[PDB]
Write an enzyme that holds these catalytic residues in place. Sequence first.
Site, short mmCIF file in Angstrom:
data_model
loop_
_atom_site.label_atom_id
_atom_site.label_comp_id
_atom_site.label_asym_id
_atom_site.label_seq_id
_atom_site.Cartn_x
_atom_site.Cartn_y
_atom_site.Cartn_z
CG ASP A 130 -2.04 -1.04 1.45
OD1 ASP A 130 -2.57 -1.42 0.38
OD2 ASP A 130 -2.36 -1.24 2.56
CG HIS A 185 -4.34 5.75 7.57
ND1 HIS A 185 -5.29 5.27 8.77
CD2 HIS A 185 -4.98 5.75 6.72
CE1 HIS A 185 -6.46 5.30 8.27
NE2 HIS A 185 -6.24 5.52 6.94
CG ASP A 230 -10.21 9.66 5.65
OD1 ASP A 230 -10.64 8.47 5.93
OD2 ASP A 230 -9.63 10.32 5.12
CG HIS A 285 -10.25 4.67 5.52
ND1 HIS A 285 -10.29 5.50 4.51
CD2 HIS A 285 -10.53 3.19 5.30
CE1 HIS A 285 -10.39 4.55 3.48
NE2 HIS A 285 -10.74 3.23 3.91
CG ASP A 331 -12.04 8.71 2.51
OD1 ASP A 331 -12.36 9.64 3.36
OD2 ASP A 331 -10.76 7.89 2.64
CE1 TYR A 366 -7.16 6.42 -2.74
CE2 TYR A 366 -8.99 4.90 -2.24
CZ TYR A 366 -7.62 5.28 -2.10
OH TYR A 366 -6.88 4.36 -1.44
#
Length: 396
Positions: free
Chosen positions: A97, A139, A175, A177, A266, A310
């Site tokens: 990733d 992250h 986000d 995530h 996102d 994205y």
Amino acid sequence: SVGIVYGDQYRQLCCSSPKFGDRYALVMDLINAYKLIPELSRVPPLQWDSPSRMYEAVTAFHSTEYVDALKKLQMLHCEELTADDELLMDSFSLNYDCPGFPSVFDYSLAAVQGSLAAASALICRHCEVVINWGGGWHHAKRSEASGFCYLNDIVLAIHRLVSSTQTRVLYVDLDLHHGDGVEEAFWYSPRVVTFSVHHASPGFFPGTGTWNIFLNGAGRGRFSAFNLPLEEGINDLDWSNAIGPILDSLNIVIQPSYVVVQCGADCLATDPHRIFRLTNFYPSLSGYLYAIKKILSWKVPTLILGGGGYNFPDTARLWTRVTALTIEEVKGKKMTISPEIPEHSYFSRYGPDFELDIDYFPDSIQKHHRRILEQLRNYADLNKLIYDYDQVYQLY
Ligand SMILES: O=C(NO)c1sc2ccccc2c1Cl
Ligand SMILES: O=C(NO)c1sc2ccccc2c1Cl
Ligand SMILES: [K+]
Ligand SMILES: [K+]
Ligand SMILES: [Zn+2]
């Protein structure tokens, strides 16, 4: 005085990755096409006096060995890797990733330079709010790259804010995530309160910010890490009602000196993840705009950062509206944005309709609200903060 991080070199660096391509350019050129740039104070990214000073800044969070590995990864991608070099990268998850690419170190360093300069502009009181659409890499861990985050610009910016003097920072992560990297960095710190709203489900990245019971910090930082995992398909209104009383209660109890908001795009209904159904609508009212407007109503110096997203033109459409909303809320000046995309170099990327609105037609939360309220009471008791339970209870 709303600040925005930008610069010619900064733009080239933010646009140098294989994953985020030219997203930052679309974002900044759409803000410029909407004539928002004259309303904003340009915040230049931080540059250092020496390699040692840069290392001292990045190593306030990341290990020296990790920074060395990331800088070597860039060098290696500027000339294949030996078996020993592949092992070294794997020991820091600099693979899969988070691959290497010719500008990997410069690119991830740029977000840190931007977010540290943004924190400095808030500290010297030059800006009430600062935006960094090149930042928000939540992250990245001390010695591990994760989810295309190589350097954690947020942690370093928060670290600069918390240490500027008792300074308390409220970190809000919007986000899709879970903001695991930021939450992990401040797990043992009561002065940085983290709150991430996100999707969580088995096998879904990064896997945290959900039932383990809920972990919420440790040591003196117990009850300082908040999380609201939400089911797939949530719309603007339900997401707005889910987070609204939490944001307001966190502000009343914590009384933050600074707020740092991660605004990863996102969650948009048009993001290819296709998990949440949030919009950038500003009449349903965008969950993002509701949350941003609510945070800015507190009048606390704020750092607004990017993150995921994205669908590049739709991330640009949302962040252009977040930008205009911030100008309005801070300056008290009406910002009128035409519903049609104005002509600019990236105009063709907004087709086939060329509109600012994204192309979209639209008990568990109560249980989490009760859990969060108890955690907030617990955090307040541990930290000896004076609060009114009834003023907080009535928000929910
Ligand atoms: O310094 C301020 N007022 O005297 C203001 S106005 C405002 C609006 C949004 C966020 C922060 C902020 C601050 Cl600080
Ligand atoms: O947008 C993101 N996080 O906020 C994520 S999660 C993830 C996992 C694997 C690869 C990239 C990535 C990104 Cl970008
Ligand atoms: K989040
Ligand atoms: K914490
Ligand atoms: Zn994300």
